[PDB]
Amino acid sequence: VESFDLDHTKVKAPYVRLAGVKTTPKGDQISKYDLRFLQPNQGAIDPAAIHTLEHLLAGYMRDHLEGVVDVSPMGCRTGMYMAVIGEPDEQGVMKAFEAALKDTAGHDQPIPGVSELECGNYRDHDLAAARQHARDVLDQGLKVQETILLER
Ligand SMILES: [Zn+2]
């Protein structure tokens, strides 16, 4: 239940999807979300661009959603992973994500936290590509994706 056994060939990106839920000792819930930009195995986001997306979404997601633990790039680079403290709310998360993406598409100022002091690879960034990826998601249109499990 902490990480649904998703069949990646059956989803339709871009989308927002509850990926699992971990219950804490006191009974709180940590909801995990799959914020999918690209269709699995049909292409990937460039490393610099996803690095920039990581920087931008850390703040923009928090501007539109409470309880955010952190927003991380997925190793497969087709989307971002985000854990949130709270019961599952795919609809609410989708709306926050949509708003954060508009903020991202319109981000014409410098990328935050890009320096020797605040970033581990400050030379690896791409605002233009980051902005266009946000635009592409909004153009295509988000939806809440149901998890289709692997029969195994
Ligand atoms: Zn960085």
Swiss-Prot record:
Record keywords, A-Z: Autoinducer synthesis, Iron, Lyase, Metal-binding, Quorum sensing
PANTHER family xrefs: S-RIBOSYLHOMOCYSTEINE LYASE
Gene responsible for this protein: luxS
GO MF term list: iron ion binding; S-ribosylhomocysteine lyase activity
Entry-linked Pfam families: LuxS
Protein name: S-ribosylhomocysteine lyase
Subunit structure of this chain's protein: Homodimer.
EC top class named in words: lyase
SUPFAM superfamilies: LuxS/MPP-like metallohydrolase (SSF63411)
Organism: Deinococcus radiodurans (strain ATCC 13939 / DSM 20539 / JCM 16871 / CCUG 27074 / LMG 4051 / NBRC 15346 / NCIMB 9279 / VKM B-1422 / R1)
GO annotation, biological process: L-methionine salvage from S-adenosylmethionine; quorum sensing
